[PDB]
Amino acid sequence: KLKKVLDKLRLKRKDISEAAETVNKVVERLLRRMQKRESEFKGVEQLNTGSYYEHVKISAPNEFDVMFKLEVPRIELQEYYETGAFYLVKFNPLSHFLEGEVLSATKMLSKFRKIIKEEVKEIKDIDVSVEKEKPGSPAVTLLIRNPEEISVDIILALESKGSWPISTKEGLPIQGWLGTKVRTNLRREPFYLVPKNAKDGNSFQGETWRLSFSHTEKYILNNHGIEKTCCESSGAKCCRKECLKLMKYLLEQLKKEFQELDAFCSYHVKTAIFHMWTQDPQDSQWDPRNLSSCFDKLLAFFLECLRTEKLDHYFIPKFNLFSQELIDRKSKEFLSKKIEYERNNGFPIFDK
Amino acid sequence: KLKKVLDKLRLKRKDISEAAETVNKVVERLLRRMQKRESEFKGVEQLNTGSYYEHVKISAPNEFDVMFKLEVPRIELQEYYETGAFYLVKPLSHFLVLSATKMLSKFRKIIKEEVKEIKDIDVSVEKEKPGSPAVTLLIRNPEEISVDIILALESKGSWPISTKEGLPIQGWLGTKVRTNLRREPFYLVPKNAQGETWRLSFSHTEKYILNNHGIEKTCCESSGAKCCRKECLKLMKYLLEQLKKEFQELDAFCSYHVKTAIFHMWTQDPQDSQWDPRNLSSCFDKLLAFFLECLRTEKLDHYFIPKFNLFSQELIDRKSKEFLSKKIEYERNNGFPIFDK
DNA sequence: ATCTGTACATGTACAGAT
DNA sequence: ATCTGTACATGTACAGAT
DNA sequence: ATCTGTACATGTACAGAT
DNA sequence: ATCTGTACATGTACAGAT
Ligand SMILES: Nc1nc2c(ncn2[C@@H]2O[C@H](COP(=O)(O)O[C@@H]3[C@H](O)[C@@H](COP(=O)(O)OP(=O)(O)OP(=O)(O)O)O[C@H]3n3cnc4c(=O)[nH]c(N)nc43)[C@@H](O)[C@H]2O)c(=O)[nH]1
Ligand SMILES: Nc1nc2c(ncn2[C@@H]2O[C@H](COP(=O)(O)O[C@@H]3[C@H](O)[C@@H](COP(=O)(O)OP(=O)(O)OP(=O)(O)O)O[C@H]3n3cnc4c(=O)[nH]c(N)nc43)[C@@H](O)[C@H]2O)c(=O)[nH]1
Ligand SMILES: [Mn+2]
Ligand SMILES: [Mn+2]
Ligand SMILES: [Mn+2]
Ligand SMILES: [Mn+2]
Ligand SMILES: [Zn+2]
Ligand SMILES: [Zn+2]
């Protein structure tokens, strides 16, 4: 039943190679342009992120996420009104994006965007354009057409190599699951800042950046067991990723049908399951034979998050992704009724 | 019982700090002399190895092992008579085939000279034992402390073909750990087999394993469950040391035999729950049983180099092995009287 | 003549295909 | 059960630069 | 290139609780 | 007797500064 759904959701090697070969050409070309004729983004490095590179992309290989990360030493952060996740950056190639020592996200994103657009114009063996800028998005989104519509988000990121900001001190609670050595090593990796980029008429709007832990999330997805052999060729398979896929599909299906659910996103699902993985750390609590129970307990957990208006960021405990300020109580109650319905009627929306 | 023995074997924080502070002074000084003064070993780097740094040193902090590793360009290895572990190898121009003995001699000469210039510590250089890669230092606070300074070539290429089927950790530590470990460099120490032969060393890998030894990532961490893997190693090591001090029939045996055996046992019994502290006795007993089988069948393969049998007739006499078997069997069946000495 | 940033060479895990 | 494409990590060769 | 500062893992020592 | 919490000690990886 749920196994037959996962069969449908499974990507096909044919579609994967056709998608990947075209995506790599465009990314490769954009990346080379960044390290050229004294461009402000010379030295920028590529880091593949998101569902496709975590092997939890469902249905089709039609959306890819790439981080163009730039190392910036000597930066100091100021936390933006105790939000936990938003910061001003302060201190040179990047001199054109400054204003009284404060690095403007929107100025930097604009030039980044301008360059990409120019480079996309010079591609004439692929049908590829740049999507209209959505406010509140750090991404420059490319729309490719070959066998299929394919989205690529190119995400500008500042890379800092110092210790993670204090707001994350109590985050990443993997001690009982992946352990203290994994946590210490992960926290020795750099942290990343992407441009917030909203037009919410607030102070420091265009100079605000948001933390990103996509690199850490990637490691976790691909190293997700308490046993080192979880899902390896001499280990036992778990159903952790399969649950993620199923929850992701439920949300996508609902989202494409109801615009009441615009505020919700797959990152909500990803964050919830990270908490569940912490709560149930044993690989045996994610046995393939117990896919139904496992999926069901995930749904149950997500409903509790919705009811209590509380789903803390996994890395930044005080940043509540389900705050009244972010998502209306009505939106949450709408999604609760929709989830509850599917759960109690055999998930009819899986058959669409 | 066995818990009371481990109490005795436990090092003391006081002795640890007193030993370490003196060892570090001498190593620090020797290391600087290798670079800061223009010698053929400029660029050599320090890597601490062995029981003390694996936290399986027993009784006293009186023996320390340090690798002075030197990165070298693309060398090519020729396997020395299919032994698996020994190879001829191809600034260092003075030691030309790169001669282990010639290189070790200069290394040794330098160290000896530097030790002469130390006048706040009582420290000398032990007489060279042939077939030893080490320059051994003898220190005295009031207490005797040995330090082996081990010259190593560091090579960054793929590990030699003789190791392809070694490190069988797939069902224990897993395929990702194995692949990553095998991406680290490998090392060659001048252990002669003759004077131009080097021996492979995986002390760096053994160190990672000792400190990352569970199937669960949390084994022995503050939010994990403690196992008795290291405690078994300690106990087996003590049994051998105690026997070795009493019988010179056992001169050919060493702690590396014990370490290799337990590596195989850890592979054979990968589950952390098969090494529960509550089952220390069973665990120790099954280790003894395994070691006796190695002795009976004259077979204890190197963990990294499967075809190199450390218990070959060529290395240890059948009589030595039969002697050790009777001695182990006796202790096992009489409540380990030798633990009370 | 030497040095180097870029591209390729080699290996393997994951997961889909047979 | 075996086989195969993609991604990703680490090493090294080399045309263009110094 | 070398050195120091920071953070945290792995030990040990011991008291109060179980 | 064992376990748990705190203190005290050493080791070790890596970033930023010199
Ligand atoms: N791909 C995708 N796009 C979505 C989803 N829901 C909405 N969108 C599109 O995002 C734009 C508006 O931004 P948003 O803040 O509402 O959406 C972001 C982000 O786009 C989304 C997750 O996308 P992703 O990074 O590609 O996800 P992943 O690769 O893990 O899975 P998959 O792509 O298979 O779904 O979540 C939102 N978001 C909020 N906070 C975060 C955060 O910290 N990190 C990330 N990565 N995303 C965050 C509009 O174009 C809208 O259509 C959605 O589910 N998927
Ligand atoms: N410390 C120590 N020394 C020993 C032991 N048995 C003999 N010796 C002394 O070593 C001289 C050389 O003879 P050998 O080649 O038989 O001895 C080596 C090596 O010395 C010994 C293990 O010593 P280690 O490396 O310090 O061990 P670790 O630090 O892990 O444990 P601990 O110090 O707590 O015991 O084993 C022998 N050996 C043989 N092959 C290897 C190998 O591949 N690697 C290593 N590391 N050792 C190997 C003798 O003259 C004698 O004085 C002994 O048990 N311990
Ligand atoms: Mn995505
Ligand atoms: Mn995206
Ligand atoms: Mn030793
Ligand atoms: Mn030694
Ligand atoms: Zn798994
Ligand atoms: Zn353990």
**Domain range summary for chain A, segments of one domain joined by +:** 1-11+164-190+213-352, 12-163+191-212
Nearest nt to A229, CA vs C1'? C13
**Which of A229, A174, A203 is CA-nearest to residue B216?**
A229
Q: Which of A175, A176, A233 sits opposite B175 (nearest CB)?
A: A233
How far from the centroid of its chain's Cα atoms is residue B46's Cα? 16
Residue numbers in A near B171 (CB within 8 A): 229, 234-235
Smallest CA separation from ligand 1 atom 25, residue: A50
- Say if the Cβ atoms of A228 and B173 lie within 8 Å: yes
Q: Which residue has the tokens 């404060």?
A: A102
Instruction: Choose among A215, A172, A210: nearest CA to A87.
Output: A210
Alpha-carbon dihedral angle through residues A43, A46, A49, A53, given to the nearest 10 degrees = -160
Q: Do A226 and B217 touch (CB under 8 A)?
A: yes
Name the pairing type of β-strands A63-71 and A149-160.
parallel
Residues 150-189, chain A, touching B (beta carbon < 8 A): 175-182
Pocket test for ligand 1, best of A222, A256, A265 (most atoms within 8 A of CB): A265
Rounded Cα gap, residues B341 and B338, in angstroms: 6
Gap between the Cα atoms of B89 and B196, Å rounded: 8
Q: Is A294 helix (H, G, I), strand (E, B) or coil?
A: helix
> Is the shortest distance between the CB of B127 and ligand 2 below 6 Å?
no
Q: Is the CB of B132 under 6 A from ligand 2?
A: yes
Q: How close A223 gets to chain B, by Cα (Å)?
A: 9
Return the number of other C-beta atoms located less than 10 Å from residue B7's C-beta: 8
Query: Breaks in chain A, named by the residue before each, with C–N above 2.5 Å?
Result: 91
Q: Identify residue B326 by its one-letter amino acid code.
A: K
Helical residues (DSSP H) of chain A, grouped into ranges: 2-9, 13-34, 51-54, 105-121, 180-186, 214-222, 240-257, 266-279, 291-307, 329-344
Distances (CA, A) of B99 to A11, A206, B87, B93, B194: 57, 65, 11, 10, 9
What are the DSSP E strand ranges found in A92-148? 98-99, 102-103, 127-130, 139-145
Burial of B19 (0-12, 13-18, 19+ CB in 10 A): buried
Annotation-wise, does A214 bind a ligand?
yes
Measured in angstroms, the resolution is 2.6
* Nearest residue in B to A224, CA atom: B217
CA of A33 to C1' of D17 (A): 20
| Closest alpha carbon to B261 in B299, B223, B225 | B299
Most B CBs within 10 Å, among A174, A185, A229, A237, to test the B interface:
A229
Burial category of B93 from C-beta neighbours within 10 Å (exposed 0-12, middle 13-18, buried 19 and up): exposed
What are the beta bridge partners of residue A149?
Answer: A145
Instruction: Give the nearest nucleotide to B164, CA to C1'.
Output: C11
Q: Is B129 helix (H, G, I), strand (E, B) or coil?
A: coil
Integer Cα distance of B90 and B144 in angstroms: 39
Q: Hey, which residues does B89 pair with through a beta bridge?
A: B77, B98
* 3-state SS, residue A326: coil
Q: How far is CA A69 from CA A32, A41, A212, A298, A320, in A?
A: 13, 9, 11, 33, 26
Residue nearest to atom 50 of ligand 1 (CA): A134
Most A CBs within 10 Å: which of B175, B218, B221, as the mutation test of the A interface? B218
Contacts of B215 in chain A (CB under 8 A): 227-229
Buried b (16+ CB within 10 A) or exposed e, B149-185: bbbbbbbeeebbebbeebbbbbbbbbbebbeebeeee
Protein residues in reach of strand D (CB < 7 A): A 13, 16-17, 20-21, 23-24, 48, 52-53, 218; B 74, 156-157, 183, 185
Around Cβ B123, how many Cβ atoms within 10 Å?
A: 18
Distance from CA of B214 to the nearest CA of A (A): 8
Instruction: Confirm whether any atom of chain C, the nucleic acid strand, is less than 7 Å from CB of A241.
Output: yes
Q: Is the dihedral of CA A81, A84, A90, A92 positive or negative?
A: negative
Supply the residue whose CA is at minimum distance from atom 35 of ligand 1: A266
Q: Work out the widest C-alpha separation in chain B, in whole angstroms.
A: 59
> Collapsing DSSP states into helix, strand and coil, what is residue A71?
strand
**Going by C-beta distance under 8 Å and a sequence separation of 6 or more, which residues neighbour residue B268?**
B290
Cβ of residue B297 lies below 7 Å from strand C:
no
Atom of ligand 1 nearest to the CA of A49: 29
User: Helix, strand, coil shares of chain B as percentages rounded to 5?
Assistant: 45, 15, 40
Q: How remote is the CA of residue B138 from the centroid of ligand 5, in Å? A: 13
A275 among annotated binding-site residues: no
- Contacts of residue A180 in chain B, CB cutoff 8 Å? 218, 221-223
Q: For residue A215, what are the CA distances in angstroms to A67, A161, A230? A: 9, 13, 20
Where does residue A243 fall: left (phi above 0), alpha (psi -120 to 50 degrees), or beta otherwise? Answer: alpha
Contact between A316 and A211 under an 8 Å Cβ cutoff? The reply is yes
**B236 contact partners, CB below 8 Å, separation of at least 6:** B258, B261, B262, B284, B287, B288, B291
Would you say B246 is a known binding-site residue? no
- Distance between Cα A319 and ligand 4 center (Å): 21
Q: Is B55 in the pocket of ligand 2 (CB under 6 A)?
A: no
Does residue A231 reach within 7 angstroms of strand C, measured from its CB?
yes
Asked if the Cβ of residue A12 lies within 7 A of any atom of strand C, the reply is yes
The per-residue DSSP string of A234-274 comes to: TS---SHHHHHHHHHHHHHHHHHH-GGGTT--HHHHHHHHH
SS3 helix, strand, coil % of chain A, rounded to 5? Answer: 45, 20, 40
What is the experimental method?
Answer: X-ray
**Yes or no, beta carbons of B170 and A233 under 8 Å apart:** yes
Smallest CA–C1' separation from A20, nucleotide: D6
Whether residue B62 contacts residue B151, with contact meaning beta carbons closer than 8 Å, is answered with no
Give, in order, the Cα–Cα distances in Å from B161 to each of B164, B192, B310: 5, 21, 19
* Cβ neighbourhood burial of A252 (10 Å; 0-12, 13-18, 19+): middle
Residue A68 CA to C10 C1' — how many Å?
A: 27
Nearest Cα of chain A lies from the Cα of B84 at a distance, in angstroms, of 27
Q: Which residues of B touch A181 (CB under 8 A)?
A: 212, 217, 221
State the closest ligand 2 atom to the C-alpha of B58, by its place in the atom list counted from 1.
Answer: 34
CA distance readout (Å), B212 to A71, B58, B177, B183:
32, 20, 10, 17
* B259 token code pair: 């370490």
Backbone angles phi, psi at B112, to 5 degrees: -60, -45
**Taking CA atoms, what residue in B is nearest to A223?**
B176
Residues of B in Cβ contact (< 8 Å) with A178: 217-218
Q: Does B281 touch chain A (CB under 8 A)?
A: no
Does residue B49 have a known ligand-binding role?
Answer: yes
A13 CB and strand C closer than 7 A: yes
Strands (E) in chain B, as ranges, are 45-49, 63-71, 77-79, 86-89, 122-125, 134-140, 144-155, 186-189, 197-201
Give the position of tokens 């003075």.
B94
The shortest C-alpha distance from A177 to chain B (Å) reads 7
Return chain B residues 21..50 having CB < 7 Å to nucleic acid strand E.
Answer: 32, 35
Exposure string (b/e) for B210-230, b if CB count within 10 Å is 16 or more?
bebbbbbbbbbbeebeebbbb
A60-CA/D8-C1' distance, Å: 22
